[PDB]
Write a protein that binds this ligand. Structure first.
Ligand SMILES: [Cl-]
Ligand SMILES: [Cl-]
Ligand SMILES: [Cl-]
Ligand SMILES: [Zn+2]
Ligand SMILES: [Zn+2]
Ligand SMILES: [Zn+2]
Ligand SMILES: [Zn+2]
Ligand SMILES: [Zn+2]
Ligand SMILES: [Zn+2]
Ligand SMILES: [Zn+2]
Ligand SMILES: [Zn+2]
Ligand SMILES: [Zn+2]
Ligand SMILES: [Zn+2]
Lengths: 190, 189, 187, 189, 188, 189, 189, 189, 189, 189
């Protein structure tokens, strides 16, 4: 469901937030901040305003049926519990189907970006990317791996800075075959 | 600067409405309260004076540099309220009287200056100024290596870029040879 | 406009000329597939590369913006043989802070590259377009591509990589700025 | 097969018109003729029989594997007429008669089979079959490591990706240890 | 405990005479005062309850292990009053309530238990017990790697030897696999 | 100097009461006596002259540097009575007479000067001076690499810091080339 | 007028086997005179075919920069001892204004035919360089040969595996030292 | 046996005429004599008894394996009169009598058997058998690792391939465990 | 036992005459006295009781293994009067009483037993037995890693070979797990 | 310069009495005869002329450095009759005449000069002088790296120390670059 971004409502909330935390919204470093924060939230939650699935295009690979691997996909998301960024990379691997259906690398990157640009938990994000790729490409298998840094507890000096959370999702052939998942994972780690 | 908790929660709920979400759904019904509490810690520097954390001690035996590295540094961009995080490195030359301070106290000083609406260059300069003021050392050097996320999220910069800022006071500011040597020790791991 | 029917006829005539049998199983679909490959291979002729760039502003920082390992697939205009590699684009935003998306710079490289090209012309065209759109303080473009024209013949070593660079604005006037940018790009 | 130069040139000029270019402009007047000549060498395998290049010699001393590596391999996808290029590795175990052949002669066989409208898997099998036919060896193994550009051009696969294909005949197919050993030697630099 | 300064200082000056030194020479003029201060810091754990430093916080996002490594650890052997120093590694799995604590707070807890007349095994067990009590975790593991100087001082042992001790509570005590995994992370 | 056990023990029991502990627990039942004994061995150098330990030998074959490395070194800061421990490296060039001495004797000399209320520089200078006196060599070099605990215990300095001191006498003092190489020899592991 | 006499060569080898004290009729040597004669025909094939005529005509329309050929198989025989010295050759030439170039296999055959003679390595390298100058009329030529000599290893005089390196520069490479530096660096890399 | 120099030189002059060269040219006027001298050292084993070189000595301390590695081994293929060169490894277990012999003596025995028209397998067996006869050992093991040039000369193989041969006698032949450890020891650097 | 200087010097001069040297030349005039002097130190263990050097001390802190590694070990083969030298490793588990001994005293015990006409196995057992008798530990382990020169001097063995011997007493002899662990620590340097 | 074995055995038995041993115990019964036998091989250089071992050969192809490395070297200090052992490195530049010699002969020359009562520095110079006379080379360089045990036995020096000596003749002495290059090659592993 496509949602509504209310610029003016967001800016008013941000200015109220500055008063609540004790800051002075009128000082020079914060005059434009309510506006800049609203703009950042529009981009930070862009996935709510465009359907992530619609970005993928249709193409066919007539030569090969081998694994298509996409690596080091930029991944910037926001914890839904604390509205704090967790950022890293995503790795998507799919085996084209009998029809040879494929899609552009830039299009897979945008799909990941739109699912990540929502109030998210990393496990939900990994599963959603894999499910959409299965739905749209009708591939034999899909694998998604996200390597991200969570900042919620590191900021509150509870966990070591730099810790990396890793999540994976497997569909189709990678789910049924243990050898296939193991080989795909090795390619991602190397 | 007094933290109004109810005002913060109300603003966050308004923010959830603004972005089109439903604050009453289960995944966000506790979000306004959790975000307000997080903001209390993210801006903790606004409520306690960072300079006051430092304690008084004297090292009478030594004349060498005191160097502290990989101090956790978590801050918030004042322009976008988005985190930039990394590490800080503090080096000071104790004065003739030998005044020093605990390592944990320097870490607390960095944390409190960083836990504010900040710009990285301002944060580095503030840390250097506080150490000079309180310790009266011969020299101070501060280096912050932090990852900024504001422009990376908007696909403008490559992820993982690290910004480095430095501030030099006293001996490190007046003497270029000393600044070069100190910088080498901080950068080399 | 791309005349597909004309292209398919040309490719089929070409198969006859080289001695192949166009009716063979691996070549019956080839005239249509080759025409489609040429539509994308010369896609730059149909879209203005400069038009892809968007307008954005960096309010926080003014340091170098570096974009690396941009896929670059092009075709030699003399022999219609591919040369492929990567491109590296680095620009210093101006006072206004104008910037552009990483994907938009990537598409700009692709569209200029999807033309009958010589690598040196391509490097300058990318650098010039960024200057035009961003009005930056400086721009640097480096292309590392493998040329196949003489490797296809028996004249050149396989795997040789041609490197070209173009510097604009601050990078050309300041030797330190150019030298530092190159070190990060190559490493 | 006979190469017709003028027919190829007419097709190339027709193709340049089809893509919207002007063949008469100064940067492309000579291009149709250059493309016709490049095609003469790019499909040279169609005009000379690859098998005839091999010469006759016998190894009376040893019966161990003959391995030839980093053989230049330049071919053309038959589906898209786009180059895919890399290296080939040929290893054969001489038979009882000890029949062997020169490294350069094997290189020419790979080159002539590769200079055709090809699919990499067919190319590997054809090379192995010819060595099997002519040398009557105990076994043959052929490995091709080439970079394909057809789908990388259409941003579908990662640039720089390497396709590896293999063909095993005789002893290398029947003995798993022999295949494992030969493969290990081929992959090592 | 209650610390008396002049009583310690009188003992230190008495000690210098006993060992044959001259307390009035310039190297030792200020030694009696500094030694009393050093004992105040060396036994700071006797004067503050180590358990009280921990603060209360809750992690609602995660269920994973919290691991803190290379915690500075400086202690004193109770038999010889000679320092043994190294690092401590603390790992706890938060309970259902998600209770956690700050890293600096765990570091200070280790310091105060270490700043006592100690034997390394007692130190490790005391730290593990304190974390179990305050955090109510599913499991706790403590590992201390310290260099002992008592016997190296008496030319009895090779310099540089490292003593390693471990303490496991809750999940790590009941599960052998979990203990092996947690240990592997600590030694690497 | 002489060691009065009863005076030391009375001070130690007084010290344990001063810090507030219970002497009757089993960890302190026998500690008051051991502290007197530990101080006897920790300050054993005050009771034996370090210079007398060296023995007499002559090297008739060689006149090159004699280098002894990783000599165990355990000492105590005189200001805080806290141990600083590490290694010592002693290198001397035998004189015209070819005079040399045993490694075990050099180790004991370092130990006896080290088993005192000490400052690292004074210890290094004393060892070097004693070697010059006893061996009458052409040159002597002494290097001590020790870890100091005084300020690390007070959380003021980084744990693991290594203090390095040097003393050069005779030929190593007059010649920079020989000193530079000798220093290189000591640091290499 | 040169001609290879198979029968005369075999007779000489059989006389050679008698001279060294061996029995030519034993089973391990019955076929040796014929196999050695056949090997000498291939080892001195350069005397029977003109090396220069092998080069073909081609033109590079894209670039005028250096064409570099590396790891060309090179097998030759010392004329003084009739013992093989073997290695690789590296040929680099800058095309002229006309852009003239030639095939890699053609350059390889020119090197091989000059090498397949009674040779001295430096004269071999110079002859390759001159032939490339005359045939390609390039701006410059550089040839480098890295070969292993076996003459003294056979006579237990030198360690096996030593590599003799020779170079020859013509045209632009001889006049310009900078050009030599880049090209030479390219060959050794 | 004895070496007929004049007969060898005449054979070489006939060989030069047969291959089409001019023996009277300056490079080849001295070649026949130089080749004869090379054959004298190359086939020195035919002129000296390998068995007589070993000397008599007794090992009174130990009965464990005596291992000899990296023994220079230079030989000539009897089929092509082309060198194959490498190293030999000899390990023997002294008998009950404790008989042993010098390393230089094993080196000369290896050299004399190797300095003949040889095939590597025969060479390995001959060394092992001679050691068994003379030393009264419990067991003997010989390994030769050599590079063959015969097929590399005829452009069939890449240079540098290494042939490995082994021969086991006595205990190493009867005990699989003893041979297995010894083989691992010989191959490891 | 007591060394007889004059008898030793007379024997050495007789030895120099026997080997054909000139005792009166300048490099040998003082050799008989120097050799006798070296022998007094080389066999010093025969003149002082090795067991008496160990002192008594108690470890109240720990019950772990006490491990001593790289103890200098210089001995003389009794069969050839040739040195074999290396290191010794001594590990003992103190009993409940905590009885221990100094590192320098263990070194002297090893030195005195080693400074005799010896065979390595006897030396290892003697050291282990002495430690058991004096310290009454739960267990003792002694490992000697030494290079023997007896057979290297007579060119029978490869130089650099290391002979390893071990002796286990008490707990290390009864418990294989405890012995296996101690051995692993000693071998891994 | 005869070897009087019976005289040597009598001296060894007298030596055993002198050190306090019982020559009649079973561990020393055979020692005097074993020591005399070892001495015949250990001082073999005194009985045969080292210079005569070199043979006459000529290198007509090349005049660059011939380098022989890791030559086994076992010698005895003349002052203490204690072994010092290591390796020797010999490098010579052939003259215009090209005179050279076998590697084994250089090894034999080094062995016999080393198989004497020696001081390492005389040994290095004698080897260089012998090569200078026999080969009439342009230059010679000799380097010996040996471990001395005399003072390590007397716990005066660290075990394992390596003494390095060098001798340069002719071209290597007059040209500093030639000496520097040769020295670098010798020290490189
Ligand atoms: Cl087909
Ligand atoms: Cl490869
Ligand atoms: Cl660790
Ligand atoms: Zn969160
Ligand atoms: Zn920002
Ligand atoms: Zn081209
Ligand atoms: Zn294709
Ligand atoms: Zn203790
Ligand atoms: Zn201190
Ligand atoms: Zn030659
Ligand atoms: Zn052969
Ligand atoms: Zn012996
Ligand atoms: Zn000596």
């Amino acid at each position: 469901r496509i949602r509504v971004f209310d610029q003016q409502r967001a800016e008013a909330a941000v200015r109220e937030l500055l008063y609540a935390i004790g800051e002075d919204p009128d000082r020079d470093g914060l005059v434009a901040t309510p506006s800049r924060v609203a703009r950042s939230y529009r981009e930070m939650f862009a996935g709510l305003y465009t359907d992530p699935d619609s970005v993928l295009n249709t193409m066919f690979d007539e030569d090969h049926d081998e694994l298509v691997l996409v690596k080091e996909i930029p991944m910037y998301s926001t914890c839904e519990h604390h509205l704090v960024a967790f950022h890293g990379v995503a790795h998507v691997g799919y085996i084209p189907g009998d029809d040879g259906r494929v899609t552009g690398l830039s299009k897979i990157a945008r799909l990941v970006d739109l699912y990540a640009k929502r109030p998210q938990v990393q496990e939900r994000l990994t599963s959603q990317i894999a499910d959409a790729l299965m739905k749209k490409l009708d591939p034999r298998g899909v694998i998604v791996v996200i390597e991200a840094e969570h900042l919620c507890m590191a900021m509150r000096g509870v966990r070591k800075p730099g810790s990396v959370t890793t999540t994976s999702a497997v569909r189709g052939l990678f789910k049924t075959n243990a050898a296939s998942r193991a080989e795909a994972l090795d390619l991602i780690l190397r």
